[PDB]
Write a protein that binds this ligand. Structure first.
Ligand code: HEM
Ligand SMILES: O=C(C1CC1)n1ccc2c(-c3cnco3)cc(C(F)(F)F)cc21
Length: 437
């Protein structure tokens, strides 16, 4: 009853329903999300007010399904799911060191090596006939990159290894979804979460044993994850961040790559322009240097436009503590506010012809979106891995565009699914040819 006065209702996803309601009912709309009454806020004035202030913190109730699933601790109080400002700030500042310019520049070797491995695997299948799941292949690549870059470990998913680990991730993601929106499913989800935490325990032991033997350990994300736990009573905080980074550090990047390949399959002119750009910047070089990344300007725009229509992480929640007027609507105290870059990206009020894929929206001369576009969120709780992700995806995309032509298999859909994050409903099945053919 406390919300009844708020405007609202009395390969398609829940986010599409929210979009329809925002269009119908205005910038402040009552909705049910994660079993809780929330208010979706879609004015840029509100995005700015709430996201750009340390006064507004995440609503812990809306992160429960990341913290724990079916009684199994998952992300716990890791960097994404910690909602206490002071606890978050402490760990954020330590882990930030692993995302410095210099830290990220050193990762270019890993990015290049895994992208090269992917391209070689794909080239061998480029007979214009063999169907290849680009969603699967890009997910394996993202996983392999993350494991090496963040933890110094070789998952070798591109070689067909670690199928149990692949299964564990899938079931865990299904578990999050089931929790927030029987006997065998619970068993499989619980065991999957325990498995992921066990991988953490194993890899942490390997790190600590290497350090004690005085072997060479390159500073990485794990280094800082350990540093943040220096004098902790147990390893539960460490494992929280291990799992957080293990999942967050590949899942959204994989989704973003899959969406981009999927969309580009019906954009031949844009693809021809991307092919030309890659040809001009990197030529026949096997390896992309950091300085080459900045020169791939058109690719940068395509990837931004991809995130406008297809943000893997659709938004975020803040807790409104006290009754506040939001865009002429009285919103009661102790209310989750939902911010969605997905919704705002598809609203004609914010983007002309919103369903048109147009990289020119992000052109040098173009007016930059003002608080209407946030695929990495905004403010203090923005994505720590933004620059990491932007670099790795550019390396992967550039090498694909350098070497291969993709055709989406007829019947493949462009629809979305929500599985904790947004991703293509279909496997992005393509046939492939070498460039030139
Ligand atoms: C294209 C790829 C990516 C997208 C679209 C993305 C998106 C986001 C978004 C929207 C948030 C805010 C989430 C919230 O408010 O609940 C976030 C936070 C975060 N992301 Fe990402 N992300 C990406 C890649 C990565 C990578 C590569 C890493 C790690 C290597 C990562 C780790 C994190 C972490 C740890 C947070 C929590 C940050 C904090 O609260 O201090 N993400 N990301
Ligand atoms: O579920 C939520 C919230 C409450 C809405 N999330 C907020 C960001 C995020 C990320 C992520 C952020 N950067 C990289 O990955 C990943 C996932 C997961 F694990 F399901 F894949 C869930 C996420």
């Amino acid at each position: 009853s406390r919300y009844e006065h708020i405007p609202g209702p009395p390969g398609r996803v829940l986010q599409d329903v929210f979009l329809d309601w925002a269009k119908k009912y205005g910038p402040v709309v009552r909705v049910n999300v994660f079993h809780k009454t929330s208010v979706i806020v879609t004015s840029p004035e509100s995005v700015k007010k709430f996201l750009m202030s340390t006064k507004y913190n995440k609503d812990s109730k809306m992160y429960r399904a990341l913290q724990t699933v079916f009684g199994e601790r998952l992300f716990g109080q890791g960097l994404v799911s910690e909602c206490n400002y002071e606890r978050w700030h402490k760990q954020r500042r330590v882990i930030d060191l692993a995302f410095s310019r210099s830290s990220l520049v050193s990762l270019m070797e890993t990015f290049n090596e895994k992208a090269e491995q992917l391209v070689e695997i794909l080239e061998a299948k480029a007979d214009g006939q063999t169907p290849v799941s680009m969603q699967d292949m890009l997910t394996y690549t993202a996983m392999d990159i993350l494991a090496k870059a963040a933890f110094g470990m070789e998952t070798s998913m591109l070689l067909g290894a670690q199928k149990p680990l692949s299964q564990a991730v899938k079931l865990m993601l299904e578990g999050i979804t089931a929790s927030r929106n029987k006997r065998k499913q619970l068993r499989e989800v619980r065991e999957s979460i325990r498995f992921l935490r066990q991988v953490g325990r194993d890899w942490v032991q390997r790190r600590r044993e290497a350090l004690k033997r005085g072997e060479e350990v390159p500073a990485d994300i794990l280094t800082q994850i350990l540093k943040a736990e220096e004098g902790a009573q147990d390893d539960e905080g460490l494992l929280d961040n291990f799992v957080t980074f293990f999942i967050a550090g590949h899942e959204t990047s994989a989704n973003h790559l899959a969406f981009t390949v999927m969309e580009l399959s019906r954009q031949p002119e844009i693809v021809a322009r991307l092919q030309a750009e890659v040809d001009e910047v990197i030529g026949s070089k096997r390896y992309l240097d950091f300085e080459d990344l900045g020169r791939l300007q058109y690719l940068s725009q395509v990837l931004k436009e991809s995130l406008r229509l297809y943000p893997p992480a659709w938004g975020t929640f803040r807790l409104l503590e006290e009754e506040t007027l939001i865009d002429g609507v009285r919103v009661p105290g102790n209310t989750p506010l939902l911010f969605s870059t997905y919704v705002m990206g598809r609203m004609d009020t914010y983007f002309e012809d919103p369903l048109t894929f147009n990289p020119d929206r992000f052109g040098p001369g173009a007016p930059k979106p003002r608080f209407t576009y946030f695929p990495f969120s905004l403010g203090h709780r923005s994505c720590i891995g933004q620059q990491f992700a932007q670099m790795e995806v550019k390396v992967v995309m550039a090498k694909l565009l350098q070497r291969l032509e993709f055709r989406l298999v007829p019947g493949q859909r462009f629809g979305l699914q929500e599985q904790a994050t947004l991703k293509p409903l279909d496997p992005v099945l393509c046939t492939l040819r070498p460039r030139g053919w």
